[PDB]
Tab-separated table of C-alpha atoms and ligand atoms in Angstrom:
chain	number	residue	atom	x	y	z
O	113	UNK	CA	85.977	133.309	36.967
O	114	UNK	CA	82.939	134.952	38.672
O	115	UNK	CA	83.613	138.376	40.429
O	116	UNK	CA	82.416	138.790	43.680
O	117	UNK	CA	79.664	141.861	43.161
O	118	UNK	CA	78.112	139.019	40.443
O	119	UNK	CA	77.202	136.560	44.043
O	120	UNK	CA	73.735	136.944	46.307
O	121	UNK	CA	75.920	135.871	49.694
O	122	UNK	CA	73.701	133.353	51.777
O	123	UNK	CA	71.900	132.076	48.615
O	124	UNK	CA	72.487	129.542	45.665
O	125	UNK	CA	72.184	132.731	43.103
O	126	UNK	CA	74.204	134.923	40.894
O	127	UNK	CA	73.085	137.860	38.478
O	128	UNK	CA	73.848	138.202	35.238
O	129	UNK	CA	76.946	135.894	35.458
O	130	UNK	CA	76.291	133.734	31.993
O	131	UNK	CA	79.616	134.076	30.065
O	132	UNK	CA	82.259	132.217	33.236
O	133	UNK	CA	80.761	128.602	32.152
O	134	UNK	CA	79.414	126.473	35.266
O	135	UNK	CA	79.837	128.263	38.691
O	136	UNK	CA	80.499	126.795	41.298
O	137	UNK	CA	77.779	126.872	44.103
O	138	UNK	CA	74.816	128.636	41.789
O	139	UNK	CA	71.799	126.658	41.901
O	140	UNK	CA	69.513	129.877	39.992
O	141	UNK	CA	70.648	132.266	37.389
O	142	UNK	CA	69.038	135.604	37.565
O	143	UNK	CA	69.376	138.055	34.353
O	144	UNK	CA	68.326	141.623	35.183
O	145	UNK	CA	67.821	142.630	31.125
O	146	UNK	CA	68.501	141.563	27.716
O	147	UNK	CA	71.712	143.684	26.737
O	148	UNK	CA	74.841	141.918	25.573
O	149	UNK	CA	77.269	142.546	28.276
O	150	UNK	CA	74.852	140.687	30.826
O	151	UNK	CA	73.126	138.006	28.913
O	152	UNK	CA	76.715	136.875	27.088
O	153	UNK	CA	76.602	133.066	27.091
O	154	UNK	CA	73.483	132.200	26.953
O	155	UNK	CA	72.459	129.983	24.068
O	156	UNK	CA	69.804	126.722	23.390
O	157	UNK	CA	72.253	124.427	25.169
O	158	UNK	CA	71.932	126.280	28.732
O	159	UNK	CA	70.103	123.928	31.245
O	160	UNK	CA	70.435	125.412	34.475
O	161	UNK	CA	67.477	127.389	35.617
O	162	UNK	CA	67.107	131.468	34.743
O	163	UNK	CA	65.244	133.922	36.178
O	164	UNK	CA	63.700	137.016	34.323
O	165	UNK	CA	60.889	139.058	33.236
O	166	UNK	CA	58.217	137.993	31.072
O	167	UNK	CA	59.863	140.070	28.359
O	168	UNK	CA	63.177	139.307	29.118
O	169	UNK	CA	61.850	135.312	28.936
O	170	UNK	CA	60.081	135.966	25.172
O	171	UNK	CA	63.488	137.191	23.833
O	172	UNK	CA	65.410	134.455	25.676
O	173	UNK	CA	63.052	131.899	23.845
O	174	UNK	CA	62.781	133.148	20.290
O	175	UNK	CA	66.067	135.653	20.003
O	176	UNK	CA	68.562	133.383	21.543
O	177	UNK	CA	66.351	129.798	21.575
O	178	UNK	CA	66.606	128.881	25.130
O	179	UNK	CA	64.103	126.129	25.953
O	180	UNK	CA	61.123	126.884	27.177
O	181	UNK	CA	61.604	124.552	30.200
O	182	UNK	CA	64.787	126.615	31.966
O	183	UNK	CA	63.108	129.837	31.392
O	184	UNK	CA	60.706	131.156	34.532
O	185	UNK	CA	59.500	134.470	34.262
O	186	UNK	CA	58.383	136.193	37.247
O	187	UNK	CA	55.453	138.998	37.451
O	188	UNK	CA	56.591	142.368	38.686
O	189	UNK	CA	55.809	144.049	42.057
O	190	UNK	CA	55.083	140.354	43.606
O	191	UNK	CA	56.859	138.524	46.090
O	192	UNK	CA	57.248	135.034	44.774
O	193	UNK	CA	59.874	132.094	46.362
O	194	UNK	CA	62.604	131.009	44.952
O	195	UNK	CA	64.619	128.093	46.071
O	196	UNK	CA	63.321	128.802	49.430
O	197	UNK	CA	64.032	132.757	49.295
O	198	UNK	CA	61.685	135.343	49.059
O	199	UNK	CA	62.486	137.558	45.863
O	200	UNK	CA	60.401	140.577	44.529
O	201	UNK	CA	61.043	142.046	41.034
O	202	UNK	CA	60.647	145.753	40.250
O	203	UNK	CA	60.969	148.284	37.287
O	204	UNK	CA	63.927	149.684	36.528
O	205	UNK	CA	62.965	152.070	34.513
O	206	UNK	CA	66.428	151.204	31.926
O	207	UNK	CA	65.147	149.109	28.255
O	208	UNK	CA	62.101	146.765	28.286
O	209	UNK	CA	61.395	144.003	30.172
O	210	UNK	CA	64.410	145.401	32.722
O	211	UNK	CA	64.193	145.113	36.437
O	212	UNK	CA	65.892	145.273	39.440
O	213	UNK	CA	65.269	142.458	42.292
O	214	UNK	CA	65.392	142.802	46.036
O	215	UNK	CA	66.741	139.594	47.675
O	216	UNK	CA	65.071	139.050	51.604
O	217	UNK	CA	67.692	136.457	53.358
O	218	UNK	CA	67.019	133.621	55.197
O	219	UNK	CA	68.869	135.347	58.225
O	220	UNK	CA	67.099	138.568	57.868
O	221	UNK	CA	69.335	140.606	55.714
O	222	UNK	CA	67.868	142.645	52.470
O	223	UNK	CA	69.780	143.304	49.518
O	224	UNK	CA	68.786	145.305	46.188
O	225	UNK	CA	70.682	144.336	42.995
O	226	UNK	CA	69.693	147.412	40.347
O	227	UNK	CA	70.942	145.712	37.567
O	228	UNK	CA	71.012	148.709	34.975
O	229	UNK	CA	68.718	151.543	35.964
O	230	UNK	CA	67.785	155.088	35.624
O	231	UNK	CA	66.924	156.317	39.312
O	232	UNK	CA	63.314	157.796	39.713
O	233	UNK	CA	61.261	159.368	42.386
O	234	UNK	CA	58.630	156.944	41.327
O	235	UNK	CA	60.175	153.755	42.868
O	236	UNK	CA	60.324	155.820	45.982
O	237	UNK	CA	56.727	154.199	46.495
O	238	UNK	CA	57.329	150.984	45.163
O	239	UNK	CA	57.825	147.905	47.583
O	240	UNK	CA	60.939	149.388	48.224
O	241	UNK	CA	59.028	152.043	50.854
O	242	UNK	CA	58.217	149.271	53.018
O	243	UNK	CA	61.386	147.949	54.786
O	244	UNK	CA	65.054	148.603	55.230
O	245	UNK	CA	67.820	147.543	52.961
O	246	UNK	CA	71.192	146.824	54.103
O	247	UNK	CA	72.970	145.945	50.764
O	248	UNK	CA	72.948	148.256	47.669
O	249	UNK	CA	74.281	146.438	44.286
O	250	UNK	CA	74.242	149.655	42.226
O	251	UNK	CA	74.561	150.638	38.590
O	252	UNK	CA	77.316	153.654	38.752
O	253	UNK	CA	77.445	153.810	35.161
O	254	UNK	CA	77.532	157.944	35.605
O	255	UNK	CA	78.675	157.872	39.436
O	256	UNK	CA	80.406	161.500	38.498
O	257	UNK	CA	78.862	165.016	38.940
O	258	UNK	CA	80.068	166.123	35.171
O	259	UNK	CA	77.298	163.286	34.283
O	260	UNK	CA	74.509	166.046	33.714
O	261	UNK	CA	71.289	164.851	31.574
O	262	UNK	CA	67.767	166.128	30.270
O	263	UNK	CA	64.901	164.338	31.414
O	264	UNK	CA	63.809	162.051	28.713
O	265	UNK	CA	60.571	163.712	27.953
O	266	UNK	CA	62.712	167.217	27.045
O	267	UNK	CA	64.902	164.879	25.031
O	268	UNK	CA	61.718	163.406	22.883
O	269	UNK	CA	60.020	167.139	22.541
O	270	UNK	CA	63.502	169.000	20.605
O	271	UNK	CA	62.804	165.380	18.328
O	272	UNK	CA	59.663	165.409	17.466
O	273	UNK	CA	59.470	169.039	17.031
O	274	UNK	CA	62.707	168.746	14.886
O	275	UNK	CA	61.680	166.147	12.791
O	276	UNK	CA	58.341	167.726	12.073
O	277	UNK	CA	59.837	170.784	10.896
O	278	UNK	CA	62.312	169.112	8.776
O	279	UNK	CA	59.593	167.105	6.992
O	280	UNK	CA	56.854	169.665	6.862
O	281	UNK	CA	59.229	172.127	4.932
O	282	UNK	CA	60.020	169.030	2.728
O	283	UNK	CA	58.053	166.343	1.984
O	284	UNK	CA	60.726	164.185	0.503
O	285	UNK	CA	63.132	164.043	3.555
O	286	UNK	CA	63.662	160.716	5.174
O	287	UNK	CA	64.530	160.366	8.393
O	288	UNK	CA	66.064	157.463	9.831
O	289	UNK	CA	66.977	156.544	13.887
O	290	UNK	CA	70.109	154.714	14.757
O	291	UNK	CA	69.792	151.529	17.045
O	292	UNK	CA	71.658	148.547	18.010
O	293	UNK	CA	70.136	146.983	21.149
O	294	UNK	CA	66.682	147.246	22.657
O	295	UNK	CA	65.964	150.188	24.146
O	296	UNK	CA	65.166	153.670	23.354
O	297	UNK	CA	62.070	152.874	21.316
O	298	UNK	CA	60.205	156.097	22.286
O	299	UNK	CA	62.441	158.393	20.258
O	300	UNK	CA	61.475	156.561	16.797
O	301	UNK	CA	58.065	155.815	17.449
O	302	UNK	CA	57.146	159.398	19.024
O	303	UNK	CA	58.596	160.863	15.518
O	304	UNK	CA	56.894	158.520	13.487
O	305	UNK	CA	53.926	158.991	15.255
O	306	UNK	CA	54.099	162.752	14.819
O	307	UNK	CA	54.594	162.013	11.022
O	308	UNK	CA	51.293	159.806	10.779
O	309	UNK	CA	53.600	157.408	9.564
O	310	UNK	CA	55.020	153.798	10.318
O	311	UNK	CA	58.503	152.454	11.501
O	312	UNK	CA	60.050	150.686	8.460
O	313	UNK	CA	63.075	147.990	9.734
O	314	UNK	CA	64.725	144.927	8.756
O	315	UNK	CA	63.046	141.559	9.884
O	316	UNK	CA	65.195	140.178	12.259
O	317	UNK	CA	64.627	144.087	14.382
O	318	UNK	CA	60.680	143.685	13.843
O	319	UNK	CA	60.969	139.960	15.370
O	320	UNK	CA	63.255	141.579	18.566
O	321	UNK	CA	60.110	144.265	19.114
O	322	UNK	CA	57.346	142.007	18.629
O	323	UNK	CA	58.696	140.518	21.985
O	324	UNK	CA	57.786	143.419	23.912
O	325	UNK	CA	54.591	143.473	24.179
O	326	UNK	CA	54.091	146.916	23.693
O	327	UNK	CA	50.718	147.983	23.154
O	328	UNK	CA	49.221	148.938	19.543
O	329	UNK	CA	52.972	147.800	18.687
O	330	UNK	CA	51.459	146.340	15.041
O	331	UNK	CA	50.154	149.800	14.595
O	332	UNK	CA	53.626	151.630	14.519
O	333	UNK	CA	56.445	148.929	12.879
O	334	UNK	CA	56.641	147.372	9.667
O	335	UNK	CA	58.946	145.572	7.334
O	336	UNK	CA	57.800	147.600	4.123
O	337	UNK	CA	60.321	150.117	4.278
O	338	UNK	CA	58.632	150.714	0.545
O	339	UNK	CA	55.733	152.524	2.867
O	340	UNK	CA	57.426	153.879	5.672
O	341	UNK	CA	59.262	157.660	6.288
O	342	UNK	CA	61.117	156.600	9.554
O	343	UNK	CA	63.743	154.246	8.661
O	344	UNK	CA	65.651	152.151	11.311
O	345	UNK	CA	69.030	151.265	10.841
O	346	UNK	CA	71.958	150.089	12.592
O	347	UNK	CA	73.977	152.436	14.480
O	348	UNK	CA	77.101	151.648	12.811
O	349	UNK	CA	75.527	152.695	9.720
O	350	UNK	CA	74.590	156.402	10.921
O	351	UNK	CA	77.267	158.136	9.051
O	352	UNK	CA	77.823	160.318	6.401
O	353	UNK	CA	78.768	156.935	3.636
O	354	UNK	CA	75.901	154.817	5.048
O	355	UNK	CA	73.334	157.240	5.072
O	356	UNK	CA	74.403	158.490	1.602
O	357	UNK	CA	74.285	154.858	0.728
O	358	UNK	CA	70.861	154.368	2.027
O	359	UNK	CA	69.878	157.118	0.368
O	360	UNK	CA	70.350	156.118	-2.969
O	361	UNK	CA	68.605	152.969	-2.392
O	362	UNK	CA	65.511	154.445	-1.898
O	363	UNK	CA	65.156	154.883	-5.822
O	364	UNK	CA	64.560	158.750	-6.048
O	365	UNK	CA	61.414	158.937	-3.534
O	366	UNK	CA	63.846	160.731	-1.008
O	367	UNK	CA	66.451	164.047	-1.838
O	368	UNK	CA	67.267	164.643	2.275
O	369	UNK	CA	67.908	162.414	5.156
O	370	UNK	CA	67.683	163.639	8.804
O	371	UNK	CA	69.021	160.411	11.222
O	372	UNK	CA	69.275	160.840	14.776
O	373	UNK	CA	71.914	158.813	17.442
O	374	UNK	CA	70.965	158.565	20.596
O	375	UNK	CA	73.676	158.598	22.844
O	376	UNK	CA	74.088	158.175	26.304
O	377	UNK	CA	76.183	160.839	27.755
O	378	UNK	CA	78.520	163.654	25.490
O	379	UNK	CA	80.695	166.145	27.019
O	380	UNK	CA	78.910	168.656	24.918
O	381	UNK	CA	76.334	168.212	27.528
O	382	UNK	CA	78.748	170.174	30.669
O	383	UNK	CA	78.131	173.435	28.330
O	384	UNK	CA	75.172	173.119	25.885
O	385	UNK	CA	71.064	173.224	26.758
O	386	UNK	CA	69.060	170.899	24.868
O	387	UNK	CA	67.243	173.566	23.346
O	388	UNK	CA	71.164	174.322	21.580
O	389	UNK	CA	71.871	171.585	20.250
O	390	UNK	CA	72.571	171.519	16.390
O	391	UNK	CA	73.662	168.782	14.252
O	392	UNK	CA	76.632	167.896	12.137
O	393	UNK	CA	75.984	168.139	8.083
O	394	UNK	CA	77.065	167.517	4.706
O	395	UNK	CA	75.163	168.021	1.725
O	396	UNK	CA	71.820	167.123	2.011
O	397	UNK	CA	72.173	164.670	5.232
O	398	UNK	CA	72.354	165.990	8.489
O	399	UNK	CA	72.842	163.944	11.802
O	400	UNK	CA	71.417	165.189	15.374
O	401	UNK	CA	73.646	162.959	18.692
O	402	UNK	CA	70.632	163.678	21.398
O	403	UNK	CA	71.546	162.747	25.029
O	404	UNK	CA	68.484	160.261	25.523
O	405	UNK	CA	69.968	157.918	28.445
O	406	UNK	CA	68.507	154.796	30.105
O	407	UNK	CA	71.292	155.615	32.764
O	408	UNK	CA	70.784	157.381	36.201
O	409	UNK	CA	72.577	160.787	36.106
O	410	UNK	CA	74.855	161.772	39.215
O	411	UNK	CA	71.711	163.680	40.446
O	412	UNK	CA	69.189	160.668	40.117
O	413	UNK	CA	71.715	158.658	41.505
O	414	UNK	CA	72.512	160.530	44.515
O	415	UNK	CA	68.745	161.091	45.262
O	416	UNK	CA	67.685	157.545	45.422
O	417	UNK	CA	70.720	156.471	47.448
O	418	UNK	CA	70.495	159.506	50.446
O	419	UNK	CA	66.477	158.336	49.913
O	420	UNK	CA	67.589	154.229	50.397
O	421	UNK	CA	70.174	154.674	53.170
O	422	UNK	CA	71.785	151.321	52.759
O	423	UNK	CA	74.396	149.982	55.252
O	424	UNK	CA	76.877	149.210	52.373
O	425	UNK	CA	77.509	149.836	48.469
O	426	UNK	CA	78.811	147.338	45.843
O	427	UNK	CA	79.237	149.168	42.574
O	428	UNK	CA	78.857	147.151	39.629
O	429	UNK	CA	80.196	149.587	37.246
O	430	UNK	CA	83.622	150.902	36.550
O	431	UNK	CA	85.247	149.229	38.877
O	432	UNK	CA	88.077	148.015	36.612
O	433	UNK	CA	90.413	150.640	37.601
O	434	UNK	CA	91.813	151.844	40.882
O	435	UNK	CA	91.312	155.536	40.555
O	436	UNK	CA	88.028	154.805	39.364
O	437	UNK	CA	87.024	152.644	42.827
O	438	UNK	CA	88.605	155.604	45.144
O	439	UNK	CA	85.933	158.254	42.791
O	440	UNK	CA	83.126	156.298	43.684
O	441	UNK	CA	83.742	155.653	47.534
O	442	UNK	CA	84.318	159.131	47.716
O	443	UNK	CA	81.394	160.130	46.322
O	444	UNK	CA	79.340	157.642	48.830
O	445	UNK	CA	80.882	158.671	51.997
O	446	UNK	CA	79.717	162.415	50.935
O	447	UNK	CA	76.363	161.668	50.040
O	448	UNK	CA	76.127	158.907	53.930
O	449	UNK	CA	77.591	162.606	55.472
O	450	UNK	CA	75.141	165.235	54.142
O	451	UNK	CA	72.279	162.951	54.270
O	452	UNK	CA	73.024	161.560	58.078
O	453	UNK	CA	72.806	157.733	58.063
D	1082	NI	NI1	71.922	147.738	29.930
C-alpha cells in the first residue's frame, strides 16, 4: 500500500506512487523523473492520467509505450491548473527531464515535493523566491555531514584532463564510461568531446538519449562503435573480465582501456581531494570511481533548507529504519535553531 510521504493532503494526487496498483482516492499521477525506483509500474496498459516533463513524457511514450492520450507534459517555470489546483514545475537540477513541483492548496497551504534533487543557489531565484512554503517533501538521500562532494564541474575537469592524457600518450587506448540509467551524460560527452570524437553505444541506449532533446545531440552519439573512441557500456560490465572482454572484441584497433564509474558518494571521499584520486589497475586496463553525484550533499542540503524555512519536513529518503528517522530530525531541528525560524 501507498506510504503516506507518497500523498499531496487536500488534493486527488500522489507522486511517484506507480508500483501499489490502483490507489485509492488519486485522481492525477505525478512522476518527478524517469529512474526505476519511481516510475516502477508503469507500462502501455496504465490509463489513469500522469503528469511530467516534456522529457520525462518522450521516454514514457517510446521507452515504456504509454499512450499518448494519459501522458500531459507540463512546461517548466509556469503555473498551469490541474484538477482545479494550481501547480508549477521547476528544475531540479538531478538527470534530464527531472523536476520538482510546488503544490498551492485550495485552502492556502504551499507544499514543495523535490522529488530527487541536487540543491543549488540557483533555484534560490526561481518561483520559489516569491512566497512562503509550509511543507518540505525532501530528497535526504545524503542527509549526513560525512556526505562531502566536489562540485560537478571539478569532477568533469580531473576527466577530461585524464582522459586526454591517457589518449594523447597513446593513440590506441579506448576508453569506455559506465552507465545504467539516464543521467550523468556530461562526463562521456565532455571526454569525447575533448577527443574530437563520437559516443559509440548500443541501440536501445542511443533510442533512451534521443529523448532528451539535448542540443547538437546527433553530433556527439552514434551506434558505429566501429568509428567511435568513447565506448558506453553497462555498469555491470565495468570490471576487470568485461572490460578485458570488450577489449578483445575490438579486433586489435585497441591495446589499453581507461573506463570510468561514476559513483555517487565513496567513503574515500571523507579523506581524499579530487585532485588524489587514482584508479585501480591490472594489466593494461585501468578503472577511475569519480564522485560525480546528481544528489544534494549535506552542505547543499542544509543551505537550501535554512534558505526555504518551511514549517515542517517529510523526508522521502531513508526512512526505512528507526535510527535512520531520529539522524534526520536531528539534523533539522539544528539547522530550524542556527538559522532562527
Ligand atoms: Ni533519481
Amino acid at each position: 500500500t501507498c506510504p503516506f510521504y507518497k500523498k499531496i493532503p487536500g488534493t486527488g494526487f500522489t507522486v511517484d506512487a506507480f508500483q501499489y496498483g490502483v490507489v485509492e482516492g488519486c485522481t492525477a499521477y505525478f512522476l518527478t523523473h524517469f529512474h526505476s525506483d519511481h516510475y516502477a509500474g508503469l507500462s502501455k496498459h496504465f490509463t489513469f492520467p500522469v503528469y511530467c516533463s516534456e522529457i520525462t513524457g518522450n521516454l514514457l511514450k517510446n521507452k515504456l509505450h504509454v499512450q499518448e492520450q494519459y501522458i500531459h507534459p507540463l512546461p517548466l517555470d509556469t503555473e498551469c491548473i490541474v484538477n482545479g489546483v494550481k501547480v508549477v514545475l521547476l528544475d531540479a537540477n538531478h538527470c534530464p527531464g527531472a523536476v520538482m513541483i510546488l503544490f498551492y492548496l485550495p485552502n492556502g497551504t504551499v507544499i514543495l515535493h523535490t522529488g530527487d534533487f541536487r540543491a543549488d543557489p540557483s533555484m534560490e531565484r526561481s518561483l520559489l523566491a516569491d512566497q512562503k512554503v509550509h511543507m518540505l517533501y525532501l530528497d535526504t538521500t545524503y542527509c549526513s555531514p560525512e556526505y562531502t562532494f566536489p562540485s560537478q564541474q571539478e569532477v568533469i575537469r580531473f576527466a577530461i584532463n585524464t582522459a586526454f592524457e591517457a589518449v594523447t600518450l597513446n593513440p590506441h587506448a579506448l576508453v569506455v564510461c559506465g552507465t545504467y540509467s539516464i543521467g550523468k551524460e556530461k562526463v562521456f560527452l565532455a571526454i569525447a568531446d575533448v577527443l574530437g570524437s563520437k559516443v559509440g553505444m548500443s541501440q536501445e541506449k542511443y533510442k533512451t538519449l534521443q529523448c532528451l532533446n539535448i542540443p547538437e545531440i546527433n553530433s556527439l552519439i552514434t551506434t558505429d562503435m566501429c568509428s567511435s573512441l568513447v565506448h558506453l557500456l553497462p555498469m555491470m560490465q565495468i570490471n576487470f573480465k568485461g572490460l578485458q572482454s570488450h577489449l578483445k572484441k575490438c579486433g586489435g584497433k585497441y591495446n589499453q582501456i581507461l573506463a570510468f564509474r561514476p559513483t555517487g558518494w565513496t567513503h574515500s571521499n571523507k579523506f581524499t581531494r579530487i585532485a588524489d584520486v587514482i584508479p585501480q589497475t591490472k594489466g593494461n586496463i585501468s578503472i577511475y570511481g569519480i564522485p560525480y553525484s546528481e544528489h544534494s550533499s549535506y552542505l547543499e542540503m542544509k543551505r537550501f533548507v535554512q534558505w526555504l524555512k518551511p514549517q515542517k519536513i517529510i523526508p522521502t529518503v531513508n526512512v526505512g529504519t528507526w535510527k535512520s528517522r531520529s539522524t534526520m530530525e536531528k539534523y533539522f531541528r539544528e539547522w530550524k535553531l542556527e538559522a532562527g525560524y
